[PDB]
Design a protein around this nucleic acid. Structure first.
Ligand SMILES: [Mg+2]
Ligand SMILES: [Mg+2]
Ligand SMILES: [Mg+2]
Ligand SMILES: [Mg+2]
Ligand SMILES: [Mg+2]
Ligand SMILES: [Mg+2]
Ligand SMILES: [Mg+2]
Ligand SMILES: [Mg+2]
Ligand SMILES: [Mg+2]
Ligand SMILES: [Mg+2]
Ligand SMILES: [Mg+2]
Ligand SMILES: [Mg+2]
Ligand SMILES: [Mg+2]
Ligand SMILES: [Mg+2]
Ligand SMILES: [Mg+2]
Ligand SMILES: [Mg+2]
Ligand SMILES: [Mg+2]
Ligand SMILES: [Mg+2]
Ligand SMILES: [Mg+2]
Ligand SMILES: [Mg+2]
Ligand SMILES: [Mg+2]
Ligand SMILES: [Mg+2]
Ligand SMILES: [Mg+2]
Ligand SMILES: [Mg+2]
Lengths: 77, 50
RNA sequence: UAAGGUGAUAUGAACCGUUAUAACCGGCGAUUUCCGAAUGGGGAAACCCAGUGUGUUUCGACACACUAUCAUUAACUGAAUCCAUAGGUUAAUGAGGCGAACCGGGGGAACUGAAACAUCUAAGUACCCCGAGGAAAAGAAAUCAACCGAGAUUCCCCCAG
RNA sequence: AGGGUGACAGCCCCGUACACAAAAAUGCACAUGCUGUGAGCUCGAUGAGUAGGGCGGGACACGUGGUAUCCUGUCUGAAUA
RNA sequence: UUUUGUAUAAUGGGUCAGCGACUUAUAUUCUGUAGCAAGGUUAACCGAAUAGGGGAGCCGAAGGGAAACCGAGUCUUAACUGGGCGUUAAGUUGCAGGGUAUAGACCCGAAACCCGGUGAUCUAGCCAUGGGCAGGUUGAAGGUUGGGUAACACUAACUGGAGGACCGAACCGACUAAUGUUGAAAAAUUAGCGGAUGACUUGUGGCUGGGGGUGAAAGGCCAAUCAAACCGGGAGAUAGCU
RNA sequence: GUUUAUUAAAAACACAGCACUGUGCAAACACGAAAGUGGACGUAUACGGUGUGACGCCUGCCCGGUGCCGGAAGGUUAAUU
RNA sequence: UGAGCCUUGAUGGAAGUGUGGACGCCAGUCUGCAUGGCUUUAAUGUUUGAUGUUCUAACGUUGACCCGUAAUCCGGGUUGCGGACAGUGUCUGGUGGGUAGUUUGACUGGGGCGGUCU
RNA sequence: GCUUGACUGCGAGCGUGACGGCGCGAGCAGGUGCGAAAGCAGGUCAUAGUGAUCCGGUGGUUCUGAAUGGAAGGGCCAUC
């Protein structure tokens, strides 16, 4: 599924609206990517299906923390 | 993404400076290649003691 | 508790009981074929076939027990790669399916109304889905007030069509 | 109260008011035993990819309207008594 | 019943019996009636539970002006000789009724739109694996041997056995007619007719699903249903019509 | 040869043949939120789409309109800044 | 190669030998070459776009080999190819009967066509 | 010829419309023109020359201003 393994971001439904405001169902879905991440603390690469932001989080908090989560939460990975 | 260096490296190499690198440059090459590391405000003290 | 009983259509047969092991009622046990989440594999539900263990002064073949999957934990094992991982076996736990409404959540119509119809309405309704409890949810102010003050959430009547 | 009995029964029957009863198993309260759990004082700490913003939607009675406020798909991003 | 008008040859009714259509709730206003009266009445809730408590509140006693504001006046204008709205009549809460609002709002009736399901045991096409075609014709390529060429060509016999080839049963079709039309049959029967070694025909089993399938194409077929299947749901859709 | 099972078997559909056009393969194209599958265990003498319809003799003029193909200039033009 | 601040440009040992350029309406025997008691005419360090080359390290691989594994799925691994492209998310201009919802007046000597509508 | 009465505030009383509305009007107040003056003038000899509401623009306006001062926005007057 199109779920960001870091943020839990998933597709959400909203509307389209024309210039005449005609509503047509639609979905916003996240900017997923799947990415080889180096951990070093395990001498290995791990591919997380990750959103940008998901990346920007990993940048900030730093991988291992994020990996504490997921494992804390049960995410396969 | 400021990070601190480790070896020489590019038009910024210095064995331990606070640069401001582009993130992709950072978290895809330098760190996985061990040529820098994030400056997590804890890291800005170990290479700010020398 | 008891003088009468062996459910009903439902007589009959053969019985059982009367001062306490007749029946009947209640508490707790026992037995509880096969199918069905079905869980040993399969399958046209109630059937076909196994591996391993047990079992026979007639120790063959049959009968019985156990063997699904996932999760967590442990143990033992263990590639590409030596380390290490993935992988593999066993084990202990828990899950699975069903069920009236109420409840929270993910999705979410059109008829219809506008005396037509797009915005708007019907309506976050109907419906699909996931989940849980005896209730659910909500909740201990980054809330209101208006310079006076109040003091979580929830429900009822007002405020007011 | 009510039902039944060969027609309408306080006194025929079964009940009713009322007073009583549990060998066992259980719901609920307390009281403790066992397991798991933490209490207490001193000195600290005070929730950042967040608040806010841009784009797109959605929620708030409120249709973007002069539109506060809330939620976030997207790109951003503070102060810290 | 509907109509300008119906014995009407315009509708509806074979007959009887039973059932079958202006309701309910909450708001609002009017009439009646009752209580009290410049006042009337409580809501939830408490409850010794139709009591009693509870006056939060609602209506009325003041109007005028968009409003600030003023007030038996006020607004208009610089200002009214003025003018507009007001100042004189009582209100309010129950109970019964007439209207209206919101609801299915007097009852029955669509063709349809949306949602979730069930259907390829009919039929369309396709996939896989098995079966069928009496009898009789025609005589393609090729072959052989003579003739014939310099050798080929070519030619005659004989041989060979081609084809969405021929005639014709089974089998598959459905051109004509009559019969049948409350059938023997919700498409057949009888006499004739087409194909009949092929793009043939057939048994079993499989796959394709509803704005979707399949279609040698007719809008054909998708279970006697098809210009959007069937079952349940929204649902008492809506019906200015009968 | 096929067709409106059940009022139309035909001059309709199909057909071999013809032409245009797309497609360089992870093909175009189709089913599919996606994974994937068909196209094809094929590869331009292939495959899809469209029109025409054995064969014979042939298929003339018009690119202004609409469409398609090509066009690194310039004019106008979105979010963005 | 576009453009700011720092920078390689300018402003509020005298005199001898004296020669091209100056947007100089329309050409200075004047200055330097060895020697003599806080900018436009443009370019070095940057923070930043446009284009072109190169690289690998995200990302692709429906090439090859290896292991899980007797497995044309997936994953891991090595490697070749591709490579900041491709693809995807959000936003955005174009196209869009492929698909959907709808509109398409009334009068009227039937209706349509015509005419009419204040 | 001279001029701005094609004036501002009002309006007894009427006509005409289902209504929204439209029309006629002496007179009062302020200020103005022509006339010696009485006077006349609130557009044109009259009856066609037109468009509700909503949304919004503009100018004016101490009327409103979501704690308070402001402001936004609104109202009112004029106008598109
Ligand atoms: Mg079984
Ligand atoms: Mg099984
Ligand atoms: Mg309508
Ligand atoms: Mg205080
Ligand atoms: Mg805090
Ligand atoms: Mg008539
Ligand atoms: Mg009549
Ligand atoms: Mg008569
Ligand atoms: Mg008669
Ligand atoms: Mg009649
Ligand atoms: Mg079939
Ligand atoms: Mg034949
Ligand atoms: Mg024949
Ligand atoms: Mg049928
Ligand atoms: Mg109906
Ligand atoms: Mg409805
Ligand atoms: Mg027919
Ligand atoms: Mg026929
Ligand atoms: Mg072709
Ligand atoms: Mg033809
Ligand atoms: Mg359409
Ligand atoms: Mg509609
Ligand atoms: Mg008409
Ligand atoms: Mg405020």
């Amino acid at each position: 599924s199109r779920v960001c393994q870091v943020t839990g971001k998933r597709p959400v439904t909203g509307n389209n609206r024309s210039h005449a405001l005609n509503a047509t169902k639609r979905r916003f879905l996240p900017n997923l990517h799947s990415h080889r991440f180096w951990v070093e603390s395990e001498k290995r690469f791990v591919t997380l299906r990750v959103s940008a932001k998901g990346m920007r989080v990993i940048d900030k908090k730093g991988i291992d923390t994020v990996l504490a989560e997921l494992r804390a939460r049960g995410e396969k990975y | 993404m400021q990070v601190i260096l480790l070896d020489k490296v590019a038009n910024l190499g210095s064995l331990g400076d606070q640069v401001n690198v582009k993130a992709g440059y950072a978290r895809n090459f330098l760190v996985p290649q061990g040529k820098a590391v994030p400056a997590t405000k804890k890291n800005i003290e170990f290479f700010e003691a020398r």
